[PDB]
Amino acid sequence: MNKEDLLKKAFEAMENAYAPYSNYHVGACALMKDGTTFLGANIENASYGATNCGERSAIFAAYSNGYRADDIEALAIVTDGDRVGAPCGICRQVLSELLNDNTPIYLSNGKETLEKTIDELLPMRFTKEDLLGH
Amino acid sequence: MNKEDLLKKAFEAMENAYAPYSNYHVGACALMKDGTTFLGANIENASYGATNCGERSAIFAAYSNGYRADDIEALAIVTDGDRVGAPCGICRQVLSELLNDNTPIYLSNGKETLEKTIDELLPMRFTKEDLLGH
Amino acid sequence: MNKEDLLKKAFEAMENAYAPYSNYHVGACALMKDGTTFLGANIENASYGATNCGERSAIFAAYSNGYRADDIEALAIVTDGDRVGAPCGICRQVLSELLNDNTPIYLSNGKETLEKTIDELLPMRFTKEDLLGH
Amino acid sequence: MNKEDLLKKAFEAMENAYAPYSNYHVGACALMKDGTTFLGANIENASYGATNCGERSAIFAAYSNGYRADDIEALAIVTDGDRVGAPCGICRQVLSELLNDNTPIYLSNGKETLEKTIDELLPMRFTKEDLLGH
Ligand SMILES: [Zn+2]
Ligand SMILES: [Zn+2]
Ligand SMILES: [Zn+2]
Ligand SMILES: [Zn+2]
């Protein structure tokens, strides 16, 4: 699957968002090396702190089906915002552990597209081995 | 799909848990009325507060693919613990919004099985309409 | 300090809430046996999942200053809602860990007042011992 | 208060951490322009996702007592780790909203000290304006 088709999957996921409170929709799609895709959308809650982000929905779905970082080809995350948005800090913390440093993260607001890797988005990362080796 | 087969799916999901820090594995499976299943497993992070529970993984996956409360037939959540466990308070807050009150939640530790609905697990719920009608 | 004066502290805390997105204000006050009080208010974030609840703000402040469950006398949580609200499921999971079973939790919307304990609000608790004994 | 004395307060807070699961202790101290300090420490939960970080404990306490970003002089965050640690991505998302761009964040492991600002720690921030303008 090419970048444009993966972004199309993420825009399809964006229509599945559950965002009664903000009305702000985020779509994501995690593409596995074997070609399997996992959609993700943001899912809000009346208790706002229980809200989940769309890119977390997608990666948690992939891991729950037995995929691991080494099995993931790419992640796309999209909005219809005025500028291209990046994953929030919570999602960066998750992706810092669950993605390898070469996995592209494609970001698009439907007008422009950017490509990042997780190390660019989160300096001075606190890692699994920082904790396990403590 | 019967209860025993749904529990078997959740036990499968339990083997996909990512829990390097606690070693405690939770599996879940959300069954849609159309027969589709969504696995969920707990996914930990070196920053413990970014951990996601397995039943959240499963329900977020279902919603991210366009299913809503009315489309969900049942949810199973399993462990290998010494007693049958219920969803934690975070997950109860999520399920209080994302499940209807008649949807069975099957709980099993592999030795005993219980059936609950969300209202039993969370008294005095704070709901979408409590917030939107404020 | 009596119940009415503790509720008054929680109403003071409610005026400190940071809720630019929902405009829904929650106040809390944790009272220590030595007479010390800790205010808490809800504090929202543009990434909704990073929002903190007021009763968590209060209890985390108490613990961060060295207090523990046996050092705490009571917790008050208040709103201006149409009915008396209880802590959300996230907060119940926290209070299940950080309060003793019978420590009073006073709830008020300014029109009615209720008294609860954590056991009444959270059946089938997942506890420290369930995890440590696994 | 000077930088060394603020770090000393954060090290005092670190001794108040509640980390029964990881045994990893973090302390923080938020210093207000009026001289008031707020300690924060990490506070774990048997449901790991309900864990709170120390720097969030501190900043939520400040806001719950009425302080806002313009009042915050500095934040210190400390550990005893092998290398100097930065706030995790969750905490960066919170600090992006609750601190001004140039408020100093002092980091120390007791052997080395660094000074950062939130802009250095979190590129491509998703802000209140991005949401409110949507
Ligand atoms: Zn996010
Ligand atoms: Zn849970
Ligand atoms: Zn809450
Ligand atoms: Zn943190």
Side-chain angles (χ1 to χ4, degrees), chain B residues 26-40:
Chain B
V26 183
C29 184
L31 173 66
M32 306 302 99
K33 292 176 177 174
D34 73 6
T36 303
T37 53
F38 294 95
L39 296 191

Side-chain angles (χ1 to χ4, degrees), chain A residues 53 55-56 87-91, chain C residues 47:
Chain A
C53 292
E55 58 274 49
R56 275 185 289 153
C88 81
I90 306 168
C91 290
Chain C
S47 187

Side-chain angles (χ1 to χ4, degrees), chain A residues 16 18 21 41 46 64 68 97, chain B residues 16 18 21 41 46 64 68 97:
Chain A
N16 298 331
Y18 177 79
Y21 311 104
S64 291
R68 295 293 183 259
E97 189 153 336
Chain B
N16 297 330
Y18 177 79
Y21 310 105
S64 291
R68 292 298 184 262
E97 188 154 336

Side-chain angles (χ1 to χ4, degrees), chain A residues 16 36-41 43 57-58 60-66, chain B residues 1 5-7 9-14 16 26-42 53-69 71-78 95 99:
Chain A
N16 298 331
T36 304
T37 54
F38 293 94
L39 297 190
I43 297 160
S57 294
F60 295 153
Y63 270 69
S64 291
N65 288 96
Chain B
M1 186 180 291
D5 287 352
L6 183 59
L7 286 167
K9 292 296 295 179
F11 285 115
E12 170 184 0
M14 183 181 164
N16 297 330
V26 183
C29 184
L31 173 66
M32 306 302 99
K33 292 176 177 174
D34 73 6
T36 303
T37 53
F38 294 95
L39 296 191
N42 57 315
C53 292
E55 59 274 49
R56 276 186 288 155
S57 296
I59 294 292
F60 294 154
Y63 269 69
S64 291
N65 288 95
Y67 294 87
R68 292 298 184 262
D71 308 307
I72 297 174
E73 184 157 309
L75 177 61
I77 314 169
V78 303
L95 297 177
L99 297 185

Side-chain angles (χ1 to χ4, degrees), chain C residues 98-110 113-119:
Chain C
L98 303 187
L99 295 186
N100 286 329
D101 288 353
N102 290 110
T103 297
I105 304 169
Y106 299 114
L107 306 173
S108 183
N109 66 350
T113 297
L114 296 176
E115 184 178 351
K116 300 287 179 178
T117 64
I118 188 58
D119 264 315

Side-chain angles (χ1 to χ4, degrees), chain D residues 40-72 74-90:
Chain D
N42 58 314
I43 296 160
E44 299 183 342
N45 193 272
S47 186
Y48 282 5
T51 294
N52 195 235
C53 293
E55 58 273 52
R56 279 186 284 153
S57 295
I59 199 68
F60 295 155
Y63 269 67
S64 293
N65 287 280
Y67 292 90
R68 298 291 185 258
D70 295 326
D71 304 318
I72 297 172
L75 178 61
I77 311 168
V78 300
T79 73
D80 61 8
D82 190 55
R83 55 179 187 165
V84 180
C88 79
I90 306 166

